[model samples]
Target: FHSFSFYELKNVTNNFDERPISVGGNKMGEGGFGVVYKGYVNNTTVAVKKLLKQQFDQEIKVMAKCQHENLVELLGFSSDGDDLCLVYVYMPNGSLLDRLSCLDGTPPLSWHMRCKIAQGAANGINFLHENHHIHRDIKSANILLDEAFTAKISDFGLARASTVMTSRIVGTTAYMAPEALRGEITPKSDIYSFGVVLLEIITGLPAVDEHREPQLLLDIKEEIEDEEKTIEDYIDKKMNDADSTSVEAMYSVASQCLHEKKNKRPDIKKVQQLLQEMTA
Candidate 1:
């Protein structure tokens, strides 16, 4: 019953006249959820997610209950005959993926800011895990950025709340954990995906590019072969370089999350603490 009324969202969007949130020179993306748009609600920017009707009730339920500082705010919702729309606080910087150099044209975020974003995301995911919920999808694109560049994890309960949960595997391919691909999704799986996002933040690269293999494979190739690899070798040059110690520390935690065996991965709380300590 945390749902918002139709008339409320209408006033916020000016009778439904708004703009679509786009990427890659096109108009938006379909990431197992709604068709999102950006608009002003009483002079404050907000996102309106018009959801698909396949599992309308459950989707609405998930949208209704999730409320957190490090998570997107589901302001309200409305129903129109066969349609359902959920409103959220607008993220002016858009998604973290948009700010990454490999995708959007925006300048790459600074090292400290990247650490802060990582902390925020970790905090958000930990909040969900504490509540006995799994994010199910934690990728760069889903980490929307506010006007001040605070990162918030999205798709909080989208996967677990409906047939979408087990009907099939639905997520960004590059961020999916090996166990998840084999139908072993759990809280640890989300941690694995968080690890991938850490890589994207560190390297200024996309997870899945036009190539056959993922960027993770490319990253691993710089592995300890007949040679060796330092964590500094994996940082983004666009940040004008960063402190090697900090990079090594963060990467050490991320590498744990990326472990193929989910059982060996650190819980979301440890990931958050290490990131928090880095920023502090």
Candidate 2:
């Protein structure tokens, strides 16, 4: 059954505890919906997300309608009580953002692994666009990784059919396209956001860093266009295995995706093809 009883998940999460335990006890993280708890079900690990009434149905409907290896699977849902919950396969590796920063002193991912992740995420976004769904949010934090470092896109709360437009501004500032700020969005907007994530993968820098000269990493493109800095200068020092030619190639793709004109940005499918070509 794709439906879970509310109390069942509550018990699995030990009354929604956040304390880390031998079995990866509850409270994995928080999201726009609500708290995410780690739960053990039939010997399999899962993520139980408690969602507010506002986006619960919308997220559930969209997730139920879409399925792709690169997109997080919606295993089941619970709506027995006032609290609504959705379940998913737990991603042991956490978010791409945390891994890029080597949180908890974990070993940094090799350049090869990073490139694979980039391609996987682009493929997922392309799938969404092909289905006429626009994922309004596409930051590194929303890109989760499984144990094998396979990237899976998550969090569909802001997703909508490409034919729809928002009446209000939404999404993370550092990842939003210029048109998105005015509440206008398209598949190209998602491309713009993914472009920022691509820069993060290469530069090992946060999308927004108050301490940095330009703050938003996307602005570095301007520096490059003006001949003030080369993409090589901004490459992550940790990526010792990164090839200069490949890095420059991916940078060109990112540059096009970040173009101020939305129509000028390459389609998500083309971006996916380019990322895959880099691996070949």
Candidate 3:
């Protein structure tokens, strides 16, 4: 709700130790953005994300303006030092990416849970678009799950009010839209990225894997189009409860979101409804 002193966060995270819990360090994980540290404040668990470089205050303003159940809540921030720190509620279930991999030997997510996450994330993206905010980065890593397994979108560092162009491409290459590579950002661009996320959730595969024949997961769509593979052939082997009918229905939605022509993609509203109706 307010700002915290940089020194205070350092104390909570044991001076940013890189050791594991067994060794009493607080480092949770690191990404292209920065490192995340697990900390306790006022007897409540919180995540302290320390950025690696200076950033625009616009990101802070965007997070403050967004408030939704399907979006991560920004508790506060710390700018009293070299690097900016953002404070957020800890998501025990972690990112959708790690969950799909069953990271740390965790159990696989059930089909029901997967559908819930898909619908919840679509709802989150729909809310952002409704507010005229485009989350330029929509990927499995940015979608977090709470203790109850409710999906909440995170990482608004790349969000903007609407259509805009940047000096360079600014999203995960695997999830980036064709138009986005040229710095064009619109609601439809987000739909393209979300489509990739849908593919990941369904197949339990990384978006881009150098070891795979086709490094880009989206290429599977091409494979399917060419009759080289069927949707059922790529379903996540880990999902024991997936129903083929529901999977096909969700795939239909994903296919629409990833149209080669951006304008052909379904808007977030339609995408959200498609996911929601799957559970009915």
Q: Which stretches of candidate 3 lie over 4 Å from their true place?
A: 22-24, 52-56
- What are the per-residue Cα lDDT tens digits for candidate 2 across 1-280? 2999999999988888866543456877775668888888999889988864656776788888789989998899998976788999999888999899997677888899999999999989988988999889999999999999999999888888853466877899999999998889788899999999999999999999999979999999999999998888899898679998789888988999999999888998889888888878
Cα-based lDDT for every prediction: 0.71, 0.88, 0.88
* Per-residue C-alpha lDDT of model 3 across residues 1-280, encoded as one tens digit per residue: 6899998998988887766554567877786767888889989889998882324366677878889999998888898887789999998888999999998788999988999999999989999989999888899999999999999999887788866668867888899999998878787999999999999989999999999968899999989999899998899998789989899989989889889899899899999888888878
Would you estimate the TM-scores of all the predictions?
Answer: 0.82, 0.95, 0.96
Q: Candidate 1 at residue 191, lDDT?
A: 93
Q: Rank the candidates by TM-score, best first.
A: 3, 2, 1
Best by TM-score: 3
RMSD of 3: 1.5
lDDT of 1 by residue, 170-247 (tens): 666778888787666588888988998888888777787666333453245337232476556657888865688788
